[PDB]
DNA sequence: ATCAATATCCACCTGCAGATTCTACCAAAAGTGTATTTGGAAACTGCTCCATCAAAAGGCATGTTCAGCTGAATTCAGCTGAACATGCCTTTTGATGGAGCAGTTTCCAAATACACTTTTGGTAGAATCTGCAGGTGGATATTGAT
DNA sequence: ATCAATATCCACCTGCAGATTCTACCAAAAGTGTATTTGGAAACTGCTCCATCAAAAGGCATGTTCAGCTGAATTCAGCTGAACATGCCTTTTGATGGAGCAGTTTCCAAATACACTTTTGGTAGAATCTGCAGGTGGATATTGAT
């Protein structure tokens, strides 16, 4: 039975998703998270969200996560590893200044 | 059959792997998905806090895209494409 | 002919540490600090007034500027002190 | 009869008003805005001089020096975050040696 | 006598008058000089031209006739200076540069 | 009623550099964000320049120095060249 | 001699010691001179730009503070 | 004959210099470097430097180098090394945004 | 452990350079009163646009199994970098000369703001136009097994 | 290497959603005259900073030796990815009410402008405080050979 070696599909997916611009988190789970987080700050009074506000926040959020992955993976290769681990993300965050 | 009780779990494993693939990541530890959810939650908490502050200063109750753009600006990030 | 916040920094210093002095270099640091805090708050208040197409910077824009620029407890304290100062000023 | 007097502050309410009008922030400056600004400036000055004096005392010195201000900033979670991109001339750094580095 | 725009007399497409207004309106200074909006408008036009030349080139490389945000993103990040100038700028629906590090390759 | 933008001018410049090439509305939106961003950066720096030197006028000298502080390298050389040429040709 | 070489090994090691560095590779010193040169070039270009806008021929401390401000660094004490 | 193990003196120096605030590059080489760089940039016009301008520039450059060393050294420890190397500095710079 | 070697800690001390206090007289800001101008809140109001509820329907996520690949742990040899000594050389300190260059006042031309109407040019729908999305297939390229 | 399985590449197509073009009314740029400002020129201070020249003074460059660190090599258990099977969850047009948000008026509390008397904050000297550096010695502490 034909089956690809581990990493071949991974490389194909990297090429795939780097050629595209679509959002990669599903719209509804993300927006449900957003409105839940928002209800915390408001004391329970509820605000509406322009569709463009929700998609603006999702664009910013996805760009942020993708770029954090780029940096963290540089740190991964720097440890002479190939698998991203939480310490790579934590250390990238600390060096960017976000948790320095 | 397992059902969701935290919304951050709606950020599914395969969505996070797609993000990581866009970041060129080839192999992923299984501990990565909850680390990423934590990071995302903190990012969203800060940006939404600021955007809601911009909303409540305008005596509005609808967060607009410009509220979010201004919030991101105040976190050092400039978002293009929503000033229309 | 060259103004600073030194006199005021020293007044507050003597209120919170009466036996404590401050070297001229540390006073320079303090002056930079106050100009920085002022520039930040005023900038954010200016932008708030612009976004809402108002031409007046009021204490409301200041308070929002504080709530956006200071972290957590510092903002909580800072808004308390600003509200109390302005209320106590309103009473002539 | 100063505006600072009936505001209960040491920082000069009038001077803040002038720096707001003269600083190109908005065409009009309201009445309570310089009061609130001076109140914040005083509070911020207060907390920072309180911490820096405490450090001066921890080094059993009577005089605040830039080193004491640096320690004040970087030892306080929120100050340190607020002044994260700020350099304090002749302030030095926090003593910190990573655990992996000390012998045995 | 008939009127010619300040853009006409400066040789530009960007609105000199509107720029002058935006300078007066933004609380940058109590007074705005005569040449400042001319100069500002010229710089905006040049920047727009440069970014549209790079974005149009990306549009042709991907066999498109219409610039889309993706082409603007590729224009930015493939240009040393444009990338440095817009380093903290996110382009909605822009994606990333195709980039795989050498180690990852079979 | 009205919301004004730089759409018409961006389109004129686009047809000047790629005549058979068009632009989508989202691309046009990010172009408007970009033009507003460059303007705010330049005007902000020009405002600060004028303030440091206790002058109340923003002139082309301030715009030109603001460009030279904010733009990288060759973009700055071209931008001050084009602005200078505009002010010269405008005086007539 | 070369002017950048006046930034000597022991100085760079003292800087690394303040940065908590316990062991230093012998290649570090030339890298640090490269980095310091790049930093000083940018800061000095902008500071001189500010001076020369004021029609002065003495760059002040405030010119340098403004230069650092325009690359994201806030210097206190001048 | 008495001799310390490699690393003992280095730790002693880390403690010494993290306790101090003095400038660590000597003044005259640094200022000569700045004047060389400035004369190079002005392309032959020569400017004078307030004493405070040179000292401000040195305070900032030293704070910059010290913080670059802290960050790069985090990368060093991450590679399970103790010896800071150029690739640590290069990666730290790429990740902060400075390139 | 034992002890020797070396370093750092802590308590003193007292001047001297730096910090603090004080006297001053002065423009210079800050305060006050008054004579207006205005920006922005209140009060509707028409009207988008946001929330929600419908429940199919496909598009994805989830769970399990199994192959094979990685991160972690361990050893070890060569060599890089730390430690330590000396001696000279570059830096630091202090004064000195004086040139040039900031900083202050003071006119006035020139440049800007203001306020009055005149002309358009830019915006907003509505009416035309067309490039690309999403679906299909054939060819090429890549991969995995041997 | 071939040889088969599979995926990606790349071009076709057409209808429609989004783009471009088209038409008209008013906010707003332009014109003219006028009425404040300003930032600059000119002109004598005074700093301030550059150059210099010593000699005191510590710090840098050079050399030698060895500790122990890095980079290489090896193993393995568990983990991650690929592949496939179900079932749910996000997507997707529509509909409707209405909340809430622009758009307009109307003023009135609040801010601005001007011309007044006062209080304060900055500078230059100066007298007078003290805090702390730098130097000494002796008491614990740390490190390293054994």
Author numbering:
A (entry chain E): 38 to 137
B (entry chain F): 19 to 102
C (entry chain H): 33 to 124
D (entry chain G): 15 to 118
E (entry chain C): 12 to 117
F (entry chain D): 32 to 123
G (entry chain B): 23 to 100
H (entry chain A): 38 to 136
Authors' account:
In most eukaryotes, the centromere is specified by DNA sequence-independent epigenetic mechanisms, and the centromere-specific histone H3 variant, CENP-A, plays a critical role as a key epigenetic marker for centromere specification. We previously demonstrated that the histone H4 K20 residue (H4K20) in the CENP-A nucleosome is substantially monomethylated in human and chicken cells, and revealed that this methylation is crucial for kinetochore assembly. To visualize the H4 N-terminal tail more clearly in the nucleosome, in this study, we used a chimeric H3.1 containing the CENP-A centromere targeting domain (CATD) region of CENP-A, called H3.1CATD, for the structure analysis, instead of the CENP-A nucleosome.
We purified H3.1CATD, in which amino acid residues 75–112 of human histone H3.1 were replaced with the corresponding amino acid residues 75–114 of human CENP-A, as a recombinant protein. We then reconstituted the nucleosome containing H3.1CATD. Surprisingly, we found that the orientation of the H4 N-terminal tail in the H3.1CATD nucleosome was substantially different from that observed in the canonical H3.1 nucleosome. Therefore, we named the H4 N-terminal tail conformation found in the H3.1CATD nucleosome as the outward H4-N conformation, and that observed in the H3.1 nucleosome as the inward H4-N conformation. In contrast to Q76 and D77 in the H3.1 nucleosome, the CATD V76 and K77 residues did not interact with the H4 tail, and the H3 Q76-mediated H4 R19-DNA binding was also abolished in the H3.1CATD nucleosome structure. Interestingly, the canonical H3.1 nucleosome may form both the inward and outward H4-N conformations, because the weak electron density similar to the outward H4-N conformation was observed on the ambiguous side of the H4 N-terminal tail in the H3.1 nucleosome. However, as the inward H4-N conformation was not observed in the H3.1CATD nucleosome, we propose that the CENP-A CATD residues specifically promote the formation of the outward H4-N conformation.
